[PDB]
Design a protein around this nucleic acid. Structure first.
Lengths: 138, 247, 176, 190, 199, 109
RNA sequence: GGAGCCUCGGUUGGCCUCGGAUAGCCGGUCCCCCGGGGGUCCGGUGCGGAGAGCCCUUCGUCCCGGGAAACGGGGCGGCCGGAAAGGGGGCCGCCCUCUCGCCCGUCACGCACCGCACGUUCGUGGGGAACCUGGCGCUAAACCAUUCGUAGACGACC
């Protein structure tokens, strides 16, 4: 069974291409493997984009099947997609990915020292939980 | 151009590498497949061709021309003194075949069987299994033996026994016995193994293995005849008398 | 004419050279779909030489301009009339496509004519391109997109970038 | 071309209570339960509507061949409904010219022994399929009823005994012998 | 330093090409579960394609002729053999880095097997095409140890299910640890969220 | 106290199909699998370290058995991360498929 | 169970494992039903209980303070689990060993070899001779010759 349907008004996220990493709203379907898409508030000029370079999300905003960018922009700001998108666990692990890519070597060192001590307090804890389960067993 | 008149080929290629057998004793290439339904029993024995002679019996096949008549039939006598189990051996089932898992011999092996482990009994000091024999009078050794039997109760699939003939009872010249592995077809490996564990160092007469009026297979080495030409080895036609380089 | 890359629509107008007999010959305009304007001018003379007794040596191109799409942001339904040649005889066809630009629909036709009938671009004479209204289409593969509430999933998402983690650990997921 | 969507809903009565695990469908009700797999057919099976009164099949972007499979499933599931509600009853007749084909049944209606067929000394032994019960009818001489809930197992086991009695190297237009399927119905009606 | 590939669900030729290239680069590769490999095309087609291989033997002396191996591991091993310059020293030195098996032998049953998605049936074939399991194809052409390796592989499947169920509960205690320790590692998680390691 | 060179494989000589030009080597640096990320390694100094039977002098050390053949990454090769390298002596063919180090010190950062 | 000499080389942190699906999955709660399964519910799913990952991380030492540890860190015996091509894996006590080990900070020093390459490991590596030193052990067989003839051109074989 499917949950995400390519339909007029569904917000999609572009995987590859010159716009990789931007939201965009499907306004029309040209043919089977290519859609007329437009993100007005995401710096994406209205254009034809194949269905490969897009990952359709869980956001549907309503507008007629060919309305000009002006009405798409209002429906986009009406639903306030930009803030609602940033609150999804999907976007949060997207922005958490380049945070690990922009990590400076010194920041990579500070992590190594924070990871080391954190894992110590974890492992001795579960150590105290196993010895807490064996006297629980007898 | 084709052959004018057809003729079946001479000799079978199914027996093709017609070479001297690498073995002198007949090898059981395949034992009967077992089923835990039957009681445990040995599946092979080892005898010696004595000779041939007649027999007279009254055939009882109905609807035949020889029904309720007497016939003369050529029979072969095979002298089979009882054999003695001197060890068992387990086999684990692998995707590469059947790998021998573990061998356990009996405590006291007869000298006639020890003959088999030597090429020159006269020169040897007869030391085989002398330090193995010491594993049955110390608790540390015996506590290892049962750990080998218990292990074969877990991992072994097919279990064979090492039996050998008793050359002393035969009128033959040689005294070196013939060792052999006889597969034990029967119940589960557990009851299959303990049956052999108590049969160890015991006699096994042929009457235990076979019964009368039973169909059996005979495995042995053909009577050798040395180097032979094509006429004797494959039974081709002798060429006509006029042939120059031989017919 | 190789249908290389995406074709473009050119407006080529030409005429016979002025002779003392006819001082100003009449002008002749065509819509040529071609990769570049150089092959458009040659493909222009190919057609003019078929309809008129004119050749490149007796004529001249008075204007070689490219015509742009008046609505590159509207999905349109295009009707195309062809004159391709098979291995046995020639045929007229009427093909429909659904694109944003007439030039994009024509190149969509050359690839489709090359895939369906193994017809190479030099044997096709596209003769008329009419953008038709959705109610007047005929071919059903185009008519099924005329739906105000069109809606469908992408069922079996074939994995792309299947070589970035060439030796990965987890099996890929084909459901989203 | 590729049709965007082709579907077919299947109404289910109330006595039957269907449920599906992915692309496998189990059908429970009065006469028992049936379970059929469809993991080879590649479609979307959604059981919509509270009360669960109907089942639809979906096929997105299907060509001519794989569009033909959307109805076979609706045909299969409907036969799974009839088998659990009414069962399947296949009556077979024993047509013989001169040699009476006597038939006896062993293992409580799961094995059929066919003797004296064409006056042959070879007794024909046919094993029924699991879940199919064979029986000779009463008040009628040469009929061999077949009951069961799975139409495949019933109809195949009927063709088993229908092919087990064939005339070799004769003119089959003259020797119209054997057990043939006569009527295909249900064990009970409404 | 050793690449242990799982053969379940991989297409024969697609996997052999990637293995052959890695092996030529000094990489030691171990293909496991060779009976799980799939070949494209319906089963009967692939069987006839192999029976036509059995019919090719040196007429005067079959003992010299092509050696038709019947184990799936040796069938896959021969496929890689055709994608290597095995008549040379660097070709033979390569084949020694390859080590194929049917099922999962003990040295590798407790190792995380990799997978090659570029050679995976779920990716490289349309869902309507038919395919053939190398295991079944090998069994019907001479392989004798399908039944046993099915039982041995069944043993280690539940022997791994024990370990897995032991591993979930092992780290279920771990996830229970943080919510007991959250007050004394807070100054360490925010450092891991600042650089995107826990978000 | 750690490794300070990149791992690379001596894939083979620059060749056509029936001619090979042994004066240029083809490298396969571990990690990089596209042209657009090879430009970091252009100009970097690469070495083929091996050990022989006789002892050789060692810069800043006493004679051991290890020797080197120095080279440098000249330009990107192909389209999938491979890279060309030129050494002061054509690499021996017994190195095909063995580790050669790609240092960092001609660095441009 | 100690030091050296030849020789063959490659390497330059580890991942110790569900099964599998792909028009579907993954993890939990078990309120539910039978001897682990089923069903339910709740969470995730461009997999973050993510290989786009995880683990470990080493400049060293000397003092002192803070946080973390106290059950911890390090040592000799038994105990079992392991067989497809089986680990120095885990469990008990042991006399001794430390709040030393990790994370923040103080103090001091460790050829600062004066810009420069094969550095940094796996390495008690494989193989080979010659010495160390003790403890524990161990005292064979094959072949020839001879014989046999179930074998045989000669070897072989019994």
């Amino acid at each position: 069974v499917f949950r995400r349907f390519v339909e007029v008004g569904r917000v999609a996220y572009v995987s590859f291409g010159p716009h990789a990493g931007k939201l965009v709203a499907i306004v029309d379907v040209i043919d089977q493997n290519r859609a007329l898409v437009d993100g007005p508030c995401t710096r994406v000029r209205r254009q034809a984009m194949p269905f490969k370079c897009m990952q359709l999300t869980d956001f549907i905003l309503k507008f007629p099947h060919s309305a000009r960018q002006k009405y798409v922009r209002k429906a986009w700001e009406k639903a306030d997609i930009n803030t609602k998108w940033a609150a999804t666990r999907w976007a949060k692990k997207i922005e958490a990915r380049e945070r690990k890519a922009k990590m400076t070597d010194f920041d990579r060192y500070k992590v190594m020292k924070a990871k080391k001590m954190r894992n110590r307090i974890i492992k001795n804890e579960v150590k105290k939980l196993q010895r807490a389960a064996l006297l629980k067993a007898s | 151009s084709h052959r004018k008149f057809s003729a079946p080929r001479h000799g079978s290629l199914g027996f093709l590498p017609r070479k001297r057998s690498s073995r002198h004793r007949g090898k059981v290439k395949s034992f009967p497949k077992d089923d835990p339904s039957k009681p445990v029993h040995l599946t092979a024995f080892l005898g010696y061709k004595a000779g041939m002679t007649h027999i007279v019996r009254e055939v009882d096949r109905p609807g035949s021309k020889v029904n309720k008549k007497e016939v003369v039939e050529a029979v072969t006598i095979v002298e089979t003194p009882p054999m003695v189990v001197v060890g068992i051996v387990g086999y684990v089932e692998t995707p590469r075949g059947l790998r021998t898992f573990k061998t356990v011999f009996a405590e006291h092996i007869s000298d006639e069987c020890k003959r088999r482990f030597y090429k020159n009994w006269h020169k040897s000091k007869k030391k085989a299994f002398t330090k193995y024999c010491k594993k049955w009078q110390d608790d540390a050794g015996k506590r290892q033996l049962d750990k080998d039997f218990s292990s074969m109760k877990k991992y072994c699939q097919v279990i064979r026994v090492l039996a050998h003939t008793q050359m002393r009872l035969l009128p033959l010249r040689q005294k070196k016995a013939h060792l052999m592995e006889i597969q034990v077809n029967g119940g589960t490996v557990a009851e299959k193994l303990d049956w052999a564990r108590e049969r160890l160092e015991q006699q096994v007469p042929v009457s235990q293995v076979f019964g009368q009026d039973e169909m059996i297979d005979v495995i042995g080495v053909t009577k050798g005849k040395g180097y032979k030409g094509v006429t004797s080895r494959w039974h081709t036609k002798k060429l006509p008398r006029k042939t120059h380089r031989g017919l | 004419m190789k249908a290389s890359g995406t074709l473009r629509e050119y407006k080529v107008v030409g005429r016979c050279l002025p002779t003392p007999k006819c001082r100003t010959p009449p002008l002749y305009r065509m819509r040529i779909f071609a990769p570049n304007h150089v092959v458009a001018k040659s493909r222009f003379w190919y057609f003019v030489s078929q309809l008129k007794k004119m050749k490149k040596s007796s004529g001249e191109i008075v204007y070689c301009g490219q015509v742009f799409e008046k609505s590159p942001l509207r999905v349109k339904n295009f009707g195309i009339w062809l004159r391709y040649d098979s291995r046995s005889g020639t045929h007229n066809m009427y093909r429909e496509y659904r694109d944003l630009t007439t030039a994009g629909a024509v190149t969509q036709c050359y690839r489709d004519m090359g895939a369906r009938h193994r017809a190479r671009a030099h044997s096709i004479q596209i003769m008329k391109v009419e953008e038709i209204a959705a109610s007047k289409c005929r071919r059903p593969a185009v008519k099924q997109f005329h739906d105000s509430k069109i809606k469908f999933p992408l069922p079996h998402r074939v994995l792309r970038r299947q070589h970035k983690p060439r030796f990965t650990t987890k099996r890929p997921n084909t459901f989203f | 071309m590729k049709t965007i969507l082709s579907n077919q809903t299947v109404d289910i009565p109330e006595n039957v209570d269907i449920s599906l695990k992915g692309r496998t469908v189990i059908v429970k009700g009065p006469r028992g339960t049936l379970r059929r797999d469809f993991n080879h057919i590649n479609v979307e099976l959604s059981l919509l509507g509270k009360k669960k009164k109907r089942l639809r099949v979906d096929k997105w972007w299907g060509n001519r061949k794989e569009l033909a499979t959307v109805r076979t499933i609706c045909s299969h599931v409907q036969n799974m409904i009839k088998g659990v509600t009414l069962g399947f009853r296949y009556k077979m007749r024993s047509v013989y010219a001169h040699f009476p084909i006597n038939v006896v049944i062993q293992e409580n209606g799961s094995l059929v022994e066919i003797r004296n067929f064409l006056g042959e000394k070879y007794i024909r032994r046919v094993r029924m399929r699991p879940g199919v019960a064979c029986s000779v009818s009463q008040a009628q001489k040469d009929e061999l009823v077949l009951e069961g809930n799975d139409i495949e197992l019933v109809s195949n086991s009927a063709a088993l005994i229908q092919q087990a009695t064939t005339v070799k190297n004769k003119d089959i237009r003259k020797f119209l012998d054997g057990i043939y399927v006569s009527e295909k119905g249900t064990v009970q009606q409404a | 330093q050793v690449l242990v590939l799982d053969g379940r669900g991989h297409l024969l030729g697609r996997l052999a090409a990637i293995v052959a290239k890695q092996v030529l680069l000094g990489r030691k590769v171990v293909v496991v579960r060779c009976e799980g490999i799939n070949i494209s095309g319906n089963f009967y087609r692939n069987k006839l394609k192999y029976l036509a291989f059995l019919r090719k033997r040196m007429n005067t002396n079959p003992s010299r002729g092509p050696y038709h191996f019947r184990a799936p591991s040796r069938i896959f091993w021969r496929t890689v053999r055709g994608m290597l310059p095995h008549k040379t020293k660097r070709g033979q030195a390569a084949l020694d880095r390859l080590k194929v098996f049917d099922g999962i032998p003990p040295p590798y049953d407790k190792k995380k097997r990799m997978v090659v998605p570029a050679a995976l049936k779920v990716v490289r074939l349309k869902p309507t095409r038919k395919f053939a399991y190398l295991g079944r194809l090998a069994h019907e052409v001479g392989w004798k140890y399908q039944a046993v390796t099915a039982t041995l592989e069944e043993k280690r499947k539940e022997k791994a299910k024990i370990h897995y169920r032991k591993k979930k509960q092992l780290m279920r205690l771990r996830k229970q640890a943080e919510k007991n320790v959250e007050k004394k590692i807070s100054k360490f998680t925010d450092v891991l969220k600042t650089h995107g390691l826990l978000v | 106290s750690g490794r300070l060179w990149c791992k690379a494989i001596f894939a083979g000589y620059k060749r056509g199909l029936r001619n090979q030009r042994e004066h240029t080597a083809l490298l396969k640096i571990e990690g990089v699998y596209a042209r657009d990320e090879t430009e970091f390694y252009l100009g970097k100094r690469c070495a083929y370290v091996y050990k022989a039977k006789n002892n050789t002098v060692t810069p800043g050390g006493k004679p051991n058995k290890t020797r080197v053949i120095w080279g440098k990454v000249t330009r990107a090769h192909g389209n999938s991360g491979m890279v060309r390298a030129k050494f002061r002596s054509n690499l021996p063919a017994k190195a095909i498929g063995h580790r050669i180090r790609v240092m960092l010190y001609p660095s441009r950062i």
